[PDB]
Amino acid sequence: STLQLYCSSALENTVSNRLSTALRYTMYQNQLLEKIKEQTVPIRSHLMELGLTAVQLGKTTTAQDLVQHFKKLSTQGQVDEKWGPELDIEKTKLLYTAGQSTHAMEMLSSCAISFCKSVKAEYAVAKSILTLAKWIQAEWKEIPRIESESTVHIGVGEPDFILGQLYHLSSVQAAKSWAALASWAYRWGRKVVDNASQGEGVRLLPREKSEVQNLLPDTITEEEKERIYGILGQAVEDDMVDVIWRQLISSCTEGVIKVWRKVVDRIFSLYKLSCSAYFTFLKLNAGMIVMATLRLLRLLVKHAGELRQYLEHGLETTPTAPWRGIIPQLFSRLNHPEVYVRQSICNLLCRVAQDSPHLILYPAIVGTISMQDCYSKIVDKLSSANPTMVLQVQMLVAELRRVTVLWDELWLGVLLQQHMYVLRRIQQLEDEVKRVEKHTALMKPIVFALEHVRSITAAEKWFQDNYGDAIENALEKLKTPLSWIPFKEIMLSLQQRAQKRASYILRLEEISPWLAAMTNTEIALPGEVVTIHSVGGTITILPTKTKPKKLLFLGSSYPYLFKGLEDLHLDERIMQFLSIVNTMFATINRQETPRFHARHYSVTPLGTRSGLIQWVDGATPLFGLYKRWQQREAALQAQKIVPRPSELYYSKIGPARRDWPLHVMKAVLEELMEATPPNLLAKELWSSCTTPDEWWRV
Amino acid sequence: DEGHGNNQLRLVLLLQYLENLEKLMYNAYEGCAPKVIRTFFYTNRQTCQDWLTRIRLSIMRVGLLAGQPAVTVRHGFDLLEVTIMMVVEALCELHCPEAIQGIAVWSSSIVGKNLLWINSVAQQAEGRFEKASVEYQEHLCAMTGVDCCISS
Amino acid sequence: NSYAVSVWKRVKAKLEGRDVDPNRRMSVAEQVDYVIKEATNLDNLAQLYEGWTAWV
């Protein structure tokens, strides 16, 4: 805030500068300019500091106080200043061009595109802004070589040439000036290719060339020939579609020239996306980045043959590089239907793993367990050097898959699906007996499952076969050859074992003793962007719900959990989306005292129906405090839990099916809120603050 | 009352140099039995220059115009008897030329408007007279401050 | 695979502000107010499962 952050500093700075009786003249100007560029938004103070100063920024900041009030004159001044710095001053020209493009985002006066012809039309109009814009765009020749001469944008239909020319000239000389150009070019090339697939496109020079090629016979048929060539190039083995129709009417030599003309008519049509990808790669090399990465990935997957000469040439050769810790979606595109795309993705992954390989935490080792043609080459490539850190993570993934589910209880869970199947079989057997292998061979799926459970179970690693498999060989006594009453044996031999205690869980000495034995391992980064030092402490069965397994790591402290029979892949995509969102807030996460940040959830999928995620950071649940309040109320009433959380609703809903309340639940809701204090969490954060000032920030 | 139990909250929120959303909350919270909060928080939302003319306007029509000679109100926006909130409008004297500017106009306006009422008090004029920009008058005025000056 | 597209379109409409009405670009403030009203109405807060504990 101006006062008294800057106004109080400039106050004494002016005095220190007024006594000229060293270098107190440049820092004073910098302070005055910083006070001027605020924005937002004292206008009187800005004008005062401008007059005081009146580091060339003082010439561009003045152009913003005008934008705040006079858009036209402000744009005029900005475009006039942009023509000024012809000398080697890069940090100012790009900034001026960016500030003018945003102001030029109108689209309100409609003079830039309306004067687009003025580029080469013997221009004599209209306003100083247009003249300065044309004079600055004409200077591009005096210095991503070319954007579009005649056909790329207006030849086939595109946005105003002014914005493109400005974004291209802003490239002088090096940072973020390529993002504003690449994003615009790609967003407009998308619509260009859409309209092409819907319409068509052709140029005068190539059309005249084609007309003069197939002479003498006639140019009338050449009209339809060029029209179909344009339509095909717009809609786009695709090259063969051109000859498919070219050989239909004419059916005639020139077979190679036809494709040469079709690869040019569709050349300027995709030149927009080509320049977009070029600018995106240039910006990635020079330095949102995730947006550019996703844009390049979508441009490559959508169509790689045009222009492959750019993607295949810039991706492998120093992509960023790399961006492995930004976009993990490269694997989803590894199984592309066309060649020349995975060949480059593999090299990109190898390069990203060669440096900072911890970013790709189990990127392919988990994938190979269940695309595979490339995952195999990516594993060894990313695991050849220093095989200790890769073999360690492979054995960790193996142990995690072993500890999942385990399926020792899945047998009873799958057998419990016979609520009416076994009963129907018994009824049919009784009917057959009344009449007197059909009934015995009616449960073939249950028999197959009971056989698979044993085929997978074999030699607390010794307990799974001596405690779970202790009666597994006898649990199928009648189920194997055959009522089927002998079925609860195995269902209770494993269920009662867990029910014996609440947090029934074994230490690292369980089926996966390597954890307790792995007293030291290399850095693994189990779902993070470095502390996997030796091993966690212990695990738990999470008696809260079913069915996680918390386990620390004590990395160079970091809890996690397992999830059997759960596809922890969409969860990873949602966490990546949340990370991208949070990155979208970093631009505004600057005081911004309550920093915008959506709490993450580190999820690492270890195969289909599995996953290893961090349990939680320090965070108390709200239901915890609600149950605490309920217990406190129960204690206060007794001295005058249950609650229960679910039965409490039905207890006050009886005196009102589904049901249609309708018109009655809105009353039970009030009766419950009128009893439960609304300050349960409020007082929770209030007492949980050591100070009254920390309370406000919290 | 609510009138006094809200100006304190607004001033507190302003002291944090942030939390203008917390003040807009009360601005939308006025349903519990005013528009003054909409501008009381506009100092950190948009700027200190702005939200100053808004407070002046909110001071009417409980008094005179109170407008200053040069305020640039034309383009400066393209970026009940209380007896307490009136003096509580002293926030102007912080959004007013208090931030370096010509402050005498606002003090004269406050004096002229208080001439028609009572219980309106401004801030220390001696502490504001340090804007002379000349060591002569600066020393002539600083010697009157509550503190004891020095002699080299 | 016609399910993932149904969610992508829903997300694009929610970001486009076309969640409630696909023919009106509701402003950010209007969309926030609508979401707060729908997320705070006693009617909607009463037709929720008991496990949600909307009363607390």
Tokens of C47: 């037709």
A41 touches chain B (CB under 8 A): yes
DSSP code, position A524:
-
> Which residues on adjacent β-strands are paired with residue A539?
A551
Whether the Cβ atoms of residue A72 and residue A100 lie closer than 8 Å to each other: no
Tokens of A13: 């700075």
Closest CA to A192 of A276, A291, A261: A276
B99 to A11: CB separation less than 8 angstroms, yes or no = no
* Residue C52, Cβ density class (10 Å: 0-12 exposed, 13-18 middle, ≥19 buried): exposed
Tokens of A406: 């385990």
Coil, helix or strand for A551?
A: strand
Q: What share of chain A is helix, strand, coil (3-state, %, to 5)?
A: 60, 0, 40
A416 touches chain B (CB under 8 A): no
For chain B, state the CA radius of gyration: 17
Residues in chain B: 152
Where do the DSSP E strands lie in A211-315?
none
- The per-residue b/e assignment along A636-669, b for 16 or more CB within 10 angstroms, e otherwise, is eeeeeeebebeebbeeebeeeeeeebeeebbebb
Whether the Cβ atoms of residue A97 and residue A169 lie closer than 8 Å to each other: yes
With beta carbons under 8 A apart, name residues in chain A contacting B76.
43
Rounded to whole angstroms, how far apart are CA atoms B97 and B95? 7
For chain C, state the CA radius of gyration: 14
Residues in chain A: 698
Rounded to whole angstroms, how far apart are CA atoms A190 and B110? 62
Q: Amino acid identity, residue A26?
A: T
Query: What is the DSSP code string of A559-585?
Result: --EE-TT--TTHHHHHHHHHHHHHHHH
C46 to A665: CB separation less than 8 angstroms, yes or no = yes
**Cis amide bond preceding B21, omega within 30:** no
**Cis amide bond preceding A39, omega within 30:** yes
Whether the Cβ atoms of residue A261 and residue A229 lie closer than 8 Å to each other: yes
Question: CA angle A172-A178-A183, nearest 5°?
Answer: 150
Tokens of B69: 């000679």
A45 to B78: CB separation less than 8 angstroms, yes or no = no
Coil, helix or strand for A675?
A: coil
Rounded to whole angstroms, how far apart are CA atoms A181 and A162? 12
Q: Number of A to B CB contacts under 8 A, please give it.
A: 56
SS3 string of A173-218? CCCCHHHHHHHHHHHHHHHHHHHHHHCCCCCHHHHHHHHHHCCCCC
A3 touches chain B (CB under 8 A): yes
Contact between chain A and chain B (3 or more Cβ pairs less than 8 Å apart): yes
φ, ψ for residue A550, nearest 5 deg: -75, 140
Rounded to whole angstroms, how far apart are CA atoms A475 and A493? 9
Rounded to whole angstroms, how far apart are CA atoms A624 and A630? 10
* Residue A591, Cβ density class (10 Å: 0-12 exposed, 13-18 middle, ≥19 buried): exposed
Residues 6+ apart with CB under 8 A from A627: A641, A643, A645
A21 touches chain B (CB under 8 A): no
Tokens of A217: 């016979």
With beta carbons under 8 A apart, name residues in chain A contacting C46.
661, 665-666, 668-669
Rounded to whole angstroms, how far apart are CA atoms A360 and A341? 20
Closest CA to A537 of A563, A518, A521: A518
Closest CA to A359 of A398, A318, A326: A326
Tokens of A79: 């475009």
A696 to B76: CB separation less than 8 angstroms, yes or no = no
Beta strand A550-551 with A539-540 is antiparallel
Nearest C-alpha in C relative to A630? C56
With beta carbons under 8 A apart, name residues in chain A contacting C50.
645-646, 648-650
Say how many C-beta atoms besides its own lie within 10 A of residue A466's C-beta: 11
φ, ψ for residue B52, nearest 5 deg: -90, -50
SS3 string of A595-635? CCCCCCCCEECCCCCCCEECCCCCCCCHHHHHHHHHHHHHH
- Edge to edge, the sheet with strand A612-613 lists A561-562, A612-613, A603-604
Beta strand A612-613 with A550-551 is unpaired
Whether the Cβ atoms of residue A426 and residue A483 lie closer than 8 Å to each other: yes
Closest CA to A6 of A43, A61, A45, A50: A45
Closest CA to A154 of A274, A272, A306, A234: A272
Tokens of B59: 């001071």
Residue of A12, A18, A21, A41 best to disrupt the B interface, most CBs of B under 10 A: A41
Say how many C-beta atoms besides its own lie within 10 A of residue A232's C-beta: 21
C-alpha dihedral, C27 to C31 to C37 to C43, nearest 10°: 130
**Which chains are adjacent to chain B, needing at least 3 Cβ pairs under 8 Å?**
A
> Which residues on adjacent β-strands are paired with residue A227?
none
Say how many C-beta atoms besides its own lie within 10 A of residue A437's C-beta: 5
Give whole-number Cα distances, A41 to A6, A588, B89, in Å.
Answer: 14, 17, 21
A42 to B49: CB separation less than 8 angstroms, yes or no = yes
Whether the Cβ atoms of residue A58 and residue A29 lie closer than 8 Å to each other: yes
Tokens of A624: 């915890």
* Residue A381, Cβ density class (10 Å: 0-12 exposed, 13-18 middle, ≥19 buried): middle
Rounded to whole angstroms, how far apart are CA atoms A309 and A307? 5
Rounded to whole angstroms, how far apart are CA atoms A560 and A567? 16
Tokens of A54: 């009146």
Angle between helices A622-638 and A680-687 (to 10 degrees): 100
C51 to A646: CB separation less than 8 angstroms, yes or no = yes
A41 to B46: CB separation less than 8 angstroms, yes or no = yes
Q: How far is CA A515 from the centre of its chain?
A: 32
Task: Give the method used.
Answer: cryo-EM
> Which residues on adjacent β-strands are paired with residue A612?
A562, A604
- Write out residues 63-122 of B within 8 Å (CB-CB) of A: 72, 75-76, 78-79, 94, 98-101
B61 touches chain A (CB under 8 A): no
B49 to A44: CB separation less than 8 angstroms, yes or no = yes
A245 touches chain C (CB under 8 A): no
A40 to B46: CB separation less than 8 angstroms, yes or no = yes
**Residue carrying structure tokens 């307790």:** A516
Rounded to whole angstroms, how far apart are CA atoms A462 and A445? 29
A624 touches chain C (CB under 8 A): no
**Residue carrying structure tokens 């029209």:** A227
Residues 6+ apart with CB under 8 A from A264: A206
Whether the Cβ atoms of residue A532 and residue A523 lie closer than 8 Å to each other: yes
